Design a protein around this ligand. Sequence first.
Ligand SMILES: Cn1cnc2nc(N)[nH]c(=O)c21
Ligand SMILES: Cn1cnc2nc(N)[nH]c(=O)c21
Ligand SMILES: Cn1cnc2nc(N)[nH]c(=O)c21
Ligand SMILES: [Zn+2]
Ligand SMILES: [Zn+2]
Ligand SMILES: [Zn+2]
Lengths: 429, 429, 429
Amino acid sequence: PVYVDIDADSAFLKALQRAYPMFEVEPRQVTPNDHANARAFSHLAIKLIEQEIDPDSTILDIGSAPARRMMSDRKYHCVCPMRSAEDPERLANYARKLASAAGKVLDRNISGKIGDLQAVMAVPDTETPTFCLHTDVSCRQRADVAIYQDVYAVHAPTSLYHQAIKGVRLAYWVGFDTTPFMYNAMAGAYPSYSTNWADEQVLKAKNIGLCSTDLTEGRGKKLEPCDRVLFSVGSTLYPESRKLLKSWHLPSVFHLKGKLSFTCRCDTVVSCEGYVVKRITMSPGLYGKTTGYAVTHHADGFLMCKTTDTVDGERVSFSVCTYVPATICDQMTGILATEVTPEDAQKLLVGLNQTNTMKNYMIPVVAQAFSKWAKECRKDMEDEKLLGVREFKKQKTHTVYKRPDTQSIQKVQAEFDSGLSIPLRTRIK
Amino acid sequence: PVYVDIDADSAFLKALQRAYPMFEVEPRQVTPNDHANARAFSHLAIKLIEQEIDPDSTILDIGSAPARRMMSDRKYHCVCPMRSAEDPERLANYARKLASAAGKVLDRNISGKIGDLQAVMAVPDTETPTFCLHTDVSCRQRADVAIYQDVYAVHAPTSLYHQAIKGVRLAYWVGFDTTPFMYNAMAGAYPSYSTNWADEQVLKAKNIGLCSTDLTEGRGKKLEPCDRVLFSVGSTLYPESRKLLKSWHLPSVFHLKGKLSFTCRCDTVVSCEGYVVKRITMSPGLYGKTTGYAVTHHADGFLMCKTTDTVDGERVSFSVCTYVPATICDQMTGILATEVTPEDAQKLLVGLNQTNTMKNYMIPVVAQAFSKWAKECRKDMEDEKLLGVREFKKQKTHTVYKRPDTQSIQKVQAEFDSGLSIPLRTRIK
Amino acid sequence: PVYVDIDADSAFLKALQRAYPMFEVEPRQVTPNDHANARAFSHLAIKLIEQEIDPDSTILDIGSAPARRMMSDRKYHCVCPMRSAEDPERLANYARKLASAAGKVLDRNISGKIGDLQAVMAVPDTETPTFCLHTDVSCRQRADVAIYQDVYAVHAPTSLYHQAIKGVRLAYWVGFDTTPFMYNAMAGAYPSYSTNWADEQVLKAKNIGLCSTDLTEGRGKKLEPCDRVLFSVGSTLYPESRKLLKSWHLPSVFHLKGKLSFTCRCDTVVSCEGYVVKRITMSPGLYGKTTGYAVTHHADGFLMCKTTDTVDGERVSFSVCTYVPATICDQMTGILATEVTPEDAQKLLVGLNQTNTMKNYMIPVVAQAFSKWAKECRKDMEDEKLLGVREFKKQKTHTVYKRPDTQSIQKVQAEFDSGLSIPLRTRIK
Ligand SMILES: Cn1cnc2nc(N)[nH]c(=O)c21
Ligand SMILES: Cn1cnc2nc(N)[nH]c(=O)c21
Ligand SMILES: Cn1cnc2nc(N)[nH]c(=O)c21
Ligand SMILES: [Zn+2]
Ligand SMILES: [Zn+2]
Ligand SMILES: [Zn+2]
């Protein structure tokens, strides 16, 4: 029996049910209609992690949202480095929320939280059990299992290492699937969590879901993905790094070799329409040979196609990715058996949609990806070379369609070897 | 449970429900049928702001309409600079309304309001809690959260700065969406709040929704948008400034650096068919790096196309924008998959309309924008360049269609560094 | 609850309901079937004005029809200059009506009216509260709010100024919409109040609704509108002046600068099928900058097309205007999307009519206006110039169609700086 914050008529409830077999999920929607999907996925991941941990084990909360942790009765040590502009806001409401609970209930250890916050305010560098002002690298509190949450800005090996040296044997990471960044897409969408993202070099493109072009009258030759990308989660902007996103795409077995050596395993437990819940087990010593392979089981179709656009009025081509639902791929099997036009594929996609199962601003590019993939497949079956010999004249590859129940294999690296302001601190009190 | 002033058969009630999930909105219409949409949106925004503020916190009302504030029991400090010709009219009824309530009820602090008004009349420069005669820049009363309302004539950074120096940590801004002015449109419409607007250089055009041409017999070369634009809200005229409209389109994080330094965040909370409710948090100090990006989540389609018209009998071309409803875009997905004529697109739009969901005087231009966008998309997919290289021969870009659930991203600036007349004063008493 | 003098099967009852949302209007017809529309509109305007004024405020009645004012219990000061041939007739019945009420009821201040009339008869230049014999310019009685009624022969700025100097702060003006004269139409119709009008230069035309040609056997080169125009309201004739009709089309804000300076705002409150109820607020001093713009919100379609006729047997071309109903424009949206012949447009208009919604003698010209507008729109969409540049070869403009919910903007001027005969006087007694 699990309760979600989505109306029962939404397809994402079915998606969550599929992605969380161990839980019976039923709708409960009151307030939200935009960020309900991400909130529900995060809540279900938190519940699954809680059910699969020792109730008497101290757990870090690197993905610190202390306002959220008000009902969790487990030993939570939130870590709020105070790095962004928003962190104080959260802090503020958290304090207010504590005050709101300071005289209502006595079951969630309100006095402990308030005292810990007061101690932190008196001295920022306190190591109180349920709060701190240090980065996960610089944190000092010792726990057993550490859980991350929407952390796409920290090198995964380094944070995991500095958590292991603090006795962290298990870690979880709820976030966005990192497949689009291992495939090096310029732009992409997660059109069920209301998120788009684009490389800063395509922000002035016309058709992608995160751009703003100019109505011009018309008139460096190397466009490649750069480290800086932008994530529009609904109306919120997040500047993220490609290299620190292609860092939580950890191989199945990887070694952290330094002063303390460890062998660790990452296994993606939950996967839903773009979100993933990775689990990394950390243990000292070397426990085998690292294959250096990261495996992504595509529970639903993953398309990545090279679309042509116009950036700053200049015609260019770049790659955009999306996560098609599994049912769409299943029902498009037969059509994709034939060479299908982008227009006809778009019409069939609209018909299959119907409410909708896939957002319509993606259909125009999903259809083009399907058509390019079908044409490439036919051109493949229309020419056959000699078996056993790699006969090189490298040719075009303008689509990557990972249908449901397929797997992606990437060779990755497997061997790795105090800001709070005085006025703000005064105000928070 | 929320009550609106619109008949239950109007689509705008559904639009409001979509734009205000946190409230259960039900129709209640007696008097209005023209300005019901804007009034309902403003009332819902006011209710949402009230529910999300400290009940014991003094709040400014820069968008001063003191006649309205007769039921708000919160600490309201209306600011009436007395700058426009209509300001006295409001004042008059305000006073009358106070007199109307001077001997009816004793729950809304009528005596306080009357005494404050008398003190203001005795001396204009009084700093009474619930009234003043100073501009927001020149106001002296100190509060916690400041609310704006239909303020499209004051530089947002300067007003926010002068409110922060007065201890304003939070501010709200209910108004018209500023996307059409970030895209630099010559003319545009908000065809659900009965508003049109045009640049003074196109006021003598033929087909736009705010113009008046002449039946002539026929017979500088640079037309670009200028600062002065005109808003026809129903039958009321408002001369606004482009630069002071492209000033409340604030980035997500912006710094106000002066004698007191602040870092602030603007996040659009509510968005309905053209109206927006922005929220800016003001705080001293610098709390990160400003990315200099403003993000607009297009909950409903936004079209901006270059139409050809005749101004003063001379053929010209200029850009006009509109906000198509989401359902129209959804149902036009498939058709836009194909090259569709403006005539056939217009016929399909009329059929989709049916009462109506979109006003028909816009359909003739919505269809042309749709057709131009479809043709540009096809011409894009009909030519493909080399990936990875910016091969510049800048070409035509004659449409900007931001479908529902897409995002616009504009690089904006993120680092910023006594009139009352004696006869009127005598009469008001 | 409001009661009108029109049968419930008439479309004008629906038009009135639309134009008067604040009132619940129900039919009550006994006597009239021709002038019911104008009488109902005037009565509703009078009721709305009464409900929105101080009950204890003296009000002028420049549009003096004292016979009508027998039930109005408010302080009415009718002004009858005695300028036309009809004024005595009215006077006569007025006196008779007073006598008819002289011994029936004692609630409407009949004795006061009779005494005032007797005092006026004894001395014409009396300033009695409820009667006078002076023009609004020459009137001496002092009031607060002045109401006009069907006054299309007096310069609006001068009358308003001479009323302000007499302490007139508010004024109303119920009359015919002045849009056809700001667009400078030669002839026009109000085919819901049974009114036509023509310029004296087209009174001998064939097809317009106010003309009389001659069955001739056949055989100055500048036809432009002149000041003198003729209004046929049903069977009654009214010689009006263009310049004094293009004088109550007041801008939104205008300044009356003389011995006493004032800033004033005119806002059209009610608008129905051609009639309007303008409201002008007059106040001393200067309260802003006058933009010099008059805004007309076209709640229903306004057509003005150049038709070719024969005047005195000579072929000429001149412009005629009309007010199409909103529903006709709505249902013609799709057809106007296509190039439509005047004949086929006429057939569709007849089918849409059906009783009728628009009088059929106008359909022949409404259809031609629609067809010319559609052809001009297509020729516009069939040629596109360079954006941003006014490329002048002034070309044809043979139609002006202001669809419902559009706005007309005209640059107007915003800065302005004893006949009774002895025999008649003896007879009236
Ligand atoms: C904290 N957070 C929640 N959703 C997020 N999405 C991205 N791309 N980066 C973030 O830091 C983030
Ligand atoms: C005060 N107000 C209400 N709607 C408004 N619309 C514009 N454009 N400018 C304004 O000042 C305004
Ligand atoms: C007094 N009156 C009633 N309907 C009227 N119509 C016109 N054109 N001129 C008038 O003076 C008039
Ligand atoms: Zn710690
Ligand atoms: Zn103040
Ligand atoms: Zn008088």
